[PDB]
């Protein structure tokens, strides 16, 4: 119940999420190997790049598992600097563009203040918080809609910087809102069954945010969309 | 000139299966989800359907069920190509009318043997 | 408190999945990128060899994902057993062949004796008993002595107590006494200076015990540190 | 040519790293574990050592420590190429005298830049 039922679900979900890139790896490798007379040079190269890009996705999924274990062990440390958040967000936005296009999701960025927005943070780790939020914005986007988006909004509030990740996705039921930040927790519904994941992303993101002295909360309505709020002190 | 309807939500996956079917001289029509697949049966009858299970909008179990509910659709052989590993998943798909269930990750040459066998 | 009952072991388990999968993935990615960047400097022979490594490393990664799957299926009780009349002798030989390359990469000789003439028929699930034997043969390789010229893993077949008795014997590192009670528990791995580099999740023997008990049999172990181990698997004839 | 001692317990990994080093004109000497590596330093002095951490018999942290304990061996540059991702693992290796730590999975072309930078 506690975690045990969720642990068995978690274990099955690692299997499922990794099996997808691995399927592409193996099919594309075997195809090159058995079809060398039947590939032109554009195609050979494209098939190699699939292998490489799918390895990359699998690698990201392993790094999630690692980072989580490192957090459950208070070993994950943070190193703050002075970063232009406008630049950090625009870089994160670029990193997800291909994944968002594959799901027909437009990815937007607005700053409510003028840029730059220097702030004292670990840039790797906040890039990782943003990528988890941007990825979820894509993963949990509406199934068939012509205007799907994920928007990053930057502002300066209560001393700190407020980062909102807004979507017009499936949204999150009331009962679930309390629990989404829990390790292994995933909403199970007819709108999430095909979507891969472990339930670790938001537990990791919550821990990184808290290590910076900030907090993260959510506002959602089912069928409309969700807003994830990340407040981190400026310094 | 055998025609295959290939149904899967992964563009990456469709690309590789399609490559392999075209090496044999088959034509390929692609659908991104179960509903789109049933919509394309409005314009042709395939000689074979290659079907995934876990798709948005309409899953493969619902596709297989709806394929038995229409006279014109029920005799088109279906190979299910899925990451669902369980014996129960396979049994359900076979009970829903699939001719063959193949697990992912898959061998492309084994998959093509099974395709050939159902086509002949 | 047995908070860590699973909790400390769970964190460890998570970190171990990451490590074990990272190894084949590193090869996949390094070999794919090298092919991509070296189309001009690769001869055909080397191209094909590098593609086969990608395919074989994918296959090892797939095996490890099927362990996580099967463990979740045995927790949920959905894993079923389908028996047949199988020649165990031939089933063992097939297992031994499946592990030959991996054993050879660690300089471990893999042997098979039958104490009874052969065939040795038994009414069992062939796939599931193959998977029991592969987990025991893999462990005999993984936990083999680090630097020894006569490393082996040996499968011994007998017919005992109205059943088949399969013994998997090795001359590896052996298992300490406190650890012996616990090695069949999910997530449990002996942690010592002789196991630190050895990849794994601690699920293999939990899976094997569950499969064996679904067949109405039992599995137990005998070991001495520094000498080696014997795993005993008893399954009813019919 | 420059000479590289390549230390890792995976033959599959030594193979791909060696392929990429010999593309640059380097000579390569392989060792399957830390103790074998230190044995081969009695028959030569490499310009660079590529070192894994998790090996049987002697691990790479013990290798790095012994490298500093011998006058002849202490100034050979070492790149650590490892699956150990922690900041703490990297810090320990640099404190043991590693010049650079690279994570696994790695990019063979980024690896080769770092090798060249250290050799020149
Ligand atoms: N933007 C969103 N819209 C709707 N649901 C969301 C969104 N982001 C997160 N979720 C829900 O919160 C759960 C936990 O998310 P996360 O911890 O990132 O894990 P995962 O994405 O692997 O399931 C998800 O399974 C999903 O139910
Ligand atoms: N043949 C053996 N010799 C020594 N130790 C063994 C052997 N087989 C299993 N073990 C020990 O039992 C533990 C559990 O084994 P297993 O459940 O197969 O998981 P893993 O092999 O992933 O750790 C291993 O970590 C190891 O300490």
Author numbering:
A (entry chain B): 245 to 479
B (entry chain D), D (entry chain C): 2 to 121
C (entry chain A): 242 to 479
Authors' text:
TCS are composed of two main players, a sensor protein called histidine kinase (HK) and an effector protein called response regulator (RR). The HK catalytic core is comprised of an ATP-binding domain (CA domain) and a phosphoacceptor domain containing the phosphorylatable His residue (DHp domain). RR activity is controlled by the phosphorylation of a conserved Asp residue located at the N-terminal receiver domain (REC domain). Thus, we have explored the relation between the effect of the pH and His rotamer-dependent phosphorylation from a functional and structural perspective solving the structure of several HK853–RR468 complexes at different pHs.
In order to confirm that the sulfate ion was indeed stabilized in that position thanks to the presence of the phosphorylatable His in a gauche− rotamer, we generated mutants of HK853 and RR468 defective in its phosphorylatable residues H260A and D53A, respectively, and obtained the structures of its complex (HK853H260A–RR468D53A) at pH 5.3 and 7.5. The overall structures of the complexes were similar to the HK–RRpHs but the absence of the imidazole group due to mutation of His to Ala was concomitant with absence of sulfate ion bound, supporting that the presence of the His was required to coordinate the sulfate. A second sulfate ion bound to the catalytic site of RR468 was also observed, despite absence of phosphorylatable Asp due to its mutation to Ala. The presence of sulfate ions at the active center of RRs lacking the phosphorylatable Asp has been previously reported for MaeR triggering its phosphorylated conformation.
